[PDB]
Amino acid sequence: TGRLMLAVGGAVLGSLQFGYNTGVINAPQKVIEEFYNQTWVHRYGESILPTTLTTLWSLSVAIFSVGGMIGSFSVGLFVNRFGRRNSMLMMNLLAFVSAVLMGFSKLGKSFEMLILGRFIIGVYCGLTTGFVPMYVGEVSPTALRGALGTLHQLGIVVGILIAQVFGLDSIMGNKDLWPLLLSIIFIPALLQCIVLPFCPESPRFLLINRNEENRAKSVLKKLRGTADVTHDLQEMKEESRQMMREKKVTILELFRSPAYRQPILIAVVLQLSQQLSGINAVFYYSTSIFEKAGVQQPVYATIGSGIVNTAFTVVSLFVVERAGRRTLHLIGLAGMAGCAILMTIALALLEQLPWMSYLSIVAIFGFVAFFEVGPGPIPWFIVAELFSQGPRPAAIAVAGFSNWTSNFIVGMCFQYVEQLCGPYVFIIFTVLLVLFFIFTYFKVPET
Numbered sequence: 001t002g003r004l005m006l007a008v009g010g011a012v013l014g015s016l017q018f019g020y021n022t023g024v025i026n027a028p029q030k031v032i033e034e035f036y037n038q039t040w041v042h043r044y045g046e047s048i049l050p051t052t053l054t055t056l057w058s059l060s061v062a063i064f065s066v067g068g069m070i071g072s073f074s075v076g077l078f079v080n081r082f083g084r085r086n087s088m089l090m091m092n093l094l095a096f097v098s099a100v101l102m103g104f105s106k107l108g109k110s111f112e113m114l115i116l117g118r119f120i121i122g123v124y125c126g127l128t129t130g131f132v133p134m135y136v137g138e139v140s141p142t143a144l145r146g147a148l149g150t151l152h153q154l155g156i157v158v159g160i161l162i163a164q165v166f167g168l169d170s171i172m173g174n175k176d177l178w179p180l181l182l183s184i185i186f187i188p189a190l191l192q193c194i195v196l197p198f199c200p201e202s203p204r205f206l207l208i209n210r211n212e213e214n215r216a217k218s219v220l221k222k223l224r225g226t227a228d229v230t231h232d233l234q235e236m237k238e239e240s241r242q243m244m245r246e247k248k249v250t251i252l253e254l255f256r257s258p259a260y261r262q263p264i265l266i267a268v269v270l271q272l273s274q275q276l277s278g279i280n281a282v283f284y285y286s287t288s289i290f291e292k293a294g295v296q297q298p299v300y301a302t303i304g305s306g307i308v309n310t311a312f313t314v315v316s317l318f319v320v321e322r323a324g325r326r327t328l329h330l331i332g333l334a335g336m337a338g339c340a341i342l343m344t345i346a347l348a349l350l351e352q353l354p355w356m357s358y359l360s361i362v363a364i365f366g367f368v369a370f371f372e373v374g375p376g377p378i379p380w381f382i383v384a385e386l387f388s389q390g391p392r393p394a395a396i397a398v399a400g401f402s403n404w405t406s407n408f409i410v411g412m413c414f415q416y417v418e419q420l421c422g423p424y425v426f427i428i429f430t431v432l433l434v435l436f437f438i439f440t441y442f443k444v445p446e447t
């Protein structure tokens with residue numbers, strides 16, 4: 001387990017970029033929007049309409065989710081045809097193409113380039129969320145398979161934190177360096193191009209997908225570190241048998257069989273309960289929300305939510321195992337509804353009380369803290385536990401489509417719903433946070 005580190009460290013670089021790309025468009029919203037109006041001026045001798053400047057910037061962040069959907073749809077296409085390692089390596093192309101489009105979008109005076117780059121890197125991120133968990137699982141010793149699989153979540157949450165830090169006026173969240181803020185992703189990509197070619201190919205890919213029974217020996221000994229691996233090798237040949245038993249059902253057969261229509265409904269909802277709860281309302285627009293409240297140094301409060309998120313993710317790991325799943329998803333769904341209530345108060349009494357902007361900070365700090373123990377991980381700890389090795393694939397793909405879709409709904413509609421509800425937006429999240437509470441209380445079984 002010495003070369004094992006390099007193989008994992010090179011893989012998590014994708015999940016770091018996943019988090020970084022999820023939250024670079026938070027702090028620098030004001031500056032890029034100014035570039036949008038300045039570009040609109042140069043083109044049509046006209047100041048941009050505030051409603052278009054809204055739907056346009058919303059499209060700039062939301063189109064990323066569209067890409068993630070297509071990406072998550074294409075995981076299996078590349079992963080079995082080209083292997084796990086080689087897929088992660090070649091798909092660094094999208095990151096490099098993306099970084100150029102976004103980094104040079106200012107010099108090119110084109111919000112299209114920024115939008116188009118945002119879309120592509122989204123595709124990379126939708127593919128990455130399927131490469132990294134699969135590769136780290138098809139490489140780790142069975143014992144460490146649980147722990148090492150954690151790093152995907154950590155990379156995502158840490159990646160968000162780094163993007164929020166770099167989004168300060170001091171570093172790159174300003175008028176001169178926001179193109180470098182979106183482009184810096186090329187450094188992670190370059191680091192993954194240097195590393196990966198030295199990393200091993202998935203033994204399972206060599207063994208099953210490629211029939212390289214003895215070439216798979218070579219990886220396991222250098223990788224697992226030990227001398228021989230007749231324990232590990234046979235373990236893979238037991239899963240391959242168990243997995244090839246029941247015919248893999250397709251997405252189509254999943255909808256049509258009334259045997260699956262109840263658990264699939266539970267899955268899709270648990271996914272909707274993650275995105276429509278409204279965390280990406282903060283992780284996309286935190287800096288904007290805090291400002292509307294009346295917070296000095298709002299970006300720092302966004303860095304705050306990022307730090308809280310990382311802390312409560314390290315915590316969630318020690319809790320999910322030592323407690324039940326049905327309880328945690330309700331504990332989180334409730335604490336979020338409460339914080340969403342806390343928010344609304346601090347957002348109404350602020351016009352009168354100039355200090356509730358401190359309560360709004362606590363509101364979101366706890367709003368994300370409760371998400372990271374409930375609606376965050378559990379939706380995945382249930383889908384895999386609701387299905388066997390036959391329908392679990394098609395279930396994951398559907399649940400993934402549900403996640404990206406509801407993610408696209410918040411990212412694209414939150415600002416449109418904000419210009420109507422005033423300080424009552426989080427009521428909508430509090431409404432849903434209740435409906436989801438009701439649903440999981442009666443219709444979700446414990447596992």
Ligand SMILES: C[C@H](NC(=O)[C@H](Cc1ccc(F)cc1)NC(=O)Cc1cccc(O)c1)c1ccccc1
Pocket residue numbers: 068072126129130133152153156279376380396397399400401403404
């Ligand atoms: C895209 C979709 N879901 C995710 O990526 C969510 C969405 C999310 C979660 C938290 C957050 F703060 C922001 C977003 N994130 C993830 O890490 C997915 C995941 C994690 C562990 C195991 C899995 O099988 C999937 C997905 C679908 C199928 C496979 C992998 C991911």
